[PDB]
Amino acid sequence: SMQDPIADMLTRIRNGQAANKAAVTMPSSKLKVAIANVLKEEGFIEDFKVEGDTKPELELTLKYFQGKAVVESIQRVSRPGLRIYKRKDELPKVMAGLGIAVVSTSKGVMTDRAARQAGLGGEIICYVA
Amino acid sequence: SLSTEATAKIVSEFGRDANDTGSTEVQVALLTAQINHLQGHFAEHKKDHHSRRGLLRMVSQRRKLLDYLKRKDVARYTQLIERLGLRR
Amino acid sequence: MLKAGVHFGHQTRYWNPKMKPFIFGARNKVHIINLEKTVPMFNEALAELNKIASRKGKILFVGTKRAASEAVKDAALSCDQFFVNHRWLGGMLTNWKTVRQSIKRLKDLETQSQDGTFDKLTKKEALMRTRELEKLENSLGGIKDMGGLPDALFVIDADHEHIAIKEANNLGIPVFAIVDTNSDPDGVDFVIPGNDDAIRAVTLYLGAVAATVREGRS
RNA sequence: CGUAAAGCGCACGCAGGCGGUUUGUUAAGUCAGAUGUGAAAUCCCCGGGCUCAACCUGGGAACUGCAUCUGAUACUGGCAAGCUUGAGUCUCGUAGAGGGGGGUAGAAUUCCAGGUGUAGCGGUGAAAUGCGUAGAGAUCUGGAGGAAUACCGGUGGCGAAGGCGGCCCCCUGGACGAAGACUGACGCUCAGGUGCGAAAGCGUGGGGAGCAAACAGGAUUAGAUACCCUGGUAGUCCACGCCGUAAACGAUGUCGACUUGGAGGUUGUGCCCUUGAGGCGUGGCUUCCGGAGCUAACGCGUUAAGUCGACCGCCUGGGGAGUA
Structure with a gap:
């Protein structure tokens, strides 16, 4: 609930x-x-x-x-029943790189792209295609 | 049904004050009062299954409150159980 | 811009939520339409007509209810346009390839009637063609001269005439509907909220369209 | 996992899984970097050498891992302190076949005891068995009992589910509403476990009207171990125990959030006029029709099979077999 x-x-x-x-x-x-x-x-x-x-x-x-x-699409991944964490250079591209993967980092929340240029991974929250 | 008067005596006896009627401490006494009360009606009649399910709930209700109150402040926990005769 | 009294909004309690943007509650449980957002509608869509009319496009005026069909009849036969006031023959447009053949039959008979064969066999069957002429009459009467595909569908009611709207929508053609509280505007392109079935309502409507279409060939 | 295989019959609930929101705090999980190591071979990359290749072979990458050290502190975890929109308590009321116990009312059926009165009665497709001149049936009066509650009665109400119905009394459960007060996340789910759980059936003792398995007779029938008729035992009813199964079925697990509408029913409650069987709103449960969407289709459709989240049960071709 x-x-x-x-x-x-x-x-x-x-x-x-x-x-x-x-x-x-x-x-x-x-x-x-x-x-x-x-x-x-x-x-x-x-x-x-x-x-x-x-x-x-x-x-x-x-x-x-x-x-x-x-x-056009919004699906969550790291759910309370199951968290998911990915290494910096192992993030997955969203819609071949024209969507976003809102990821929580040691530097806070940002876009998956922001994470790469900042070179850090974290808890992937969700996808928005 | 734990007559209005009965509550008006219980609340004054356990809560932080007279206006208190929500505190965990008080709530437990009310249930116990009811539980003890149904004993006679249930040691007798021994069949009112519908009624007993009603009772069985408040037993569960009570325990959850205590478990909460035990992990919070064993102090108030130890006193209440001592002042209310339970913990088989 | 309330030109005449009653066009404000009507028809029911059992409305259609699709037009929730155009409503006002009335003292009968009936709806009242916010014609305020409609004033821009008919003003704007008329400009669309004027432009296309000068393009030498065609405007087709459909009416029903048996009440306002006569009013529409005058509308197309007032400037140069075509109209359909009787039962909209299902599929005249999308299936025009064959309805074309029906048109030819009328034209021939139209000749065969006023000057052609009328006694060759017997009055009884001569009557047959006449009453048959009447059949094609009320159906393809005010459309016979078109002989192609129109480019604009001005429709009075969207309830009785959703049949054509979908068909027109299915073709590369724009439509103009005077939709009502219980009409689906999603099948229309340039929506026109307000009353449809009110008798006087169309009189205001068509004449307004009649003038715009009259000059719109500039 | 509505109808194809697949939601435990329903429920409470320990372990287990997950958990609202504010701030600080710690740095476990998570992240970054470095380091130690991760045997060679093999694979991959770029080279080289045997007439090429297979094959041999150089350097790198990788060895998807693990341990340590140092930084990061968003998210999850531990701790401390709160907040209130989740949950819970109280006050005043409301509706109800909610449950157990004790009495009680009338109609009717059957039987018994008489009165009146006379050849059928009853039954069926027809008929027969059967009841009757010892005098039935019918009708009247009196009595005996057992069980069920006509009308009201309503895809009406209550209950977790199974279920629950004349009336009155006692003991008692739950639901929901107005208005605030108060506690301060105390939750959701839940393997194992415990409880409840139709009818039938079982045990001990009662009761036994009506109904009625078994059984009998009479018909029907080619046969009739049935369908029909006349009777009829266990049972059905009460008390205390057991059994634990149902097409125990909206064939749809529980809880929570979000997403156009319409007509209804029922129970609260604030307001305008109660000015006249009303009009204007907000809540709880329930019926039907259908939008988007969903779906194999049928259909479901704010009470969802729509869009998502938590947890649990269960399915993996049919038959063999829910059996050994």
């Missing part, structure tokens, strides 16, 4: 696109906002608001290139 809110974030985004909602709100947390920045800086989302005092309401404005969803 609500084991991994990280997967919850993704799902609420995946389901958000299906309904073509403008923005999907969720109970923010430090970790989630970290991921949100990666996506926005990448271009899968627009302008997350982190409203909240003790009830963090992170609402994510969604992007639509056309009447088609921008996020």
Whole structure:
């Protein structure tokens, strides 16, 4: 019952696109906002608001290139039931290198590409094709 | 059903104060009060299976609270069990 | 820009959520449409027509309900266009390769009727062709002169006429539908929210289209 | 893993697995670098030598690993301190065939005791067995008992599931709602284990109206070890134990989050007018129709078989066999 809110974030985004909602709100947390920045800086989302005092309401404005969803695929990997860690030079490319693999590093969260140029691995969170 | 009056005596006897009705300490007494109470109704009738499932729950309820309270502050744990007669 | 009184929004409780962007709650459990976002619609789509009309394109006006079919009849026969007011013959467009043959039959008979053969066998069967002429009449009457494929489908109702919309959509052709609260706008290209079945509604509609199409050959 | 093989009958629950959120802290797992080592051969890479090749052979890479040392501290873990949106407690109420125990009411059936009265009654496709002139059936009055609760009654309600139905009383479980107060992650799942678990069946003692396996007679029938009829024992009912199986079935494990709608039913509750059987909202359970999507298709469809996460059970061609 609500084991991994990280997967919850993704799902609420995946389901958000299906309904073509403008923005999907969720109970923010430090970790989630970290991921949100990666996506926005990448271009899968627009302008997350982190409203909240003790009830963090992170609402994510969604992007639509056309009447088609921008996020073409979002699947989580290191789940609570199973974590996954990969060596620096062993990261896997997403969509032949035109997607992203949001990876948590000793230097925080970043894109899989950011990790290589920074030369460090870590816990791969998820894929966004 | 642990008459309103019964609770009004129990809460004053265990919690941090009279307005307290949520604290782990108090909650345990309430269950035990009920558990002890059903003994007669269950040592007798010996058949109300539907009712017993009701009882059996609060037994489970109680234990979980204690286990929580034991790992948190053995101090309050040791006193409550001593002040409430349990731990077979 | 409320030109005339009642066009605001109607038809039901059992609406269609697909048009949730265009609604207002009414005091009958009936919906009321936000024509405010519609004012830009019919203004804009008319420009589309004007451009294509000058391209010497064709505009096809379909009406139904038996009520406003007459109104539409006047619309196409007012500038130069074609119309379909009776039962939209399933597949005239996607299967035009054969419906073309039906058209030829009418033209010949049209000659055979006003000046042609009318007594060669017996009045009883001479009557047969006449009533047959009536059959092709209400079907391919206001379309006989087209002889090809149109380039714009102006449709009054999207409920009764989803049949053609899908067909038109299946072809490389744009459509213009006066969709209603219980209509699917996803089959349309340049949506027009508002009423469809109201009698006076089309009168406002078509004439507005009639003028735009009248000048649109500039 | 709805219908093809595959959700334990349902549930509680130890070990086990996983775990909300804030901050600090430590640096175990994780990451970076270096180091020691990881036998040679073999494989791979670039060369070389036998007329080429097979083959021999130089240098490198690799040996996917492990141990140590030093940095990194995001994520998971250990510790400490909180927070409240998860969970739980209290107060005031609500609906209900929820469970066990004790009484009780009326209709009806059967039997017994009389009154009235007379040749059929009953049964079926027809008929026969059978009941009856010792006087039935029918009808009236009185009594005896056993079991089940017409109407209300409703893809209505309650319960984990099996299930649960006249009325009254006692003991008692759970669910849900308004409004806040309070505790402060105390959770979800769960092998082994324990409990509950239809009908039938079993044991000991009661009860025995109706119904009815077995059994008998009479028909039907080519036969009829049946289907039909007349009777009828165990059983069905109560008490205490055992059995542990059902097509125990929405053939759909439990819990949680997110994702257009419509008509209904039922039970709470705030508000506008109760101004007139109402209108405006928010919650709990449940019925049907269908969007996206999903699917082998049928269909499911905010109570999902849609999109995901936690944990557990289970399947691996049919028959042999759920048997030895």
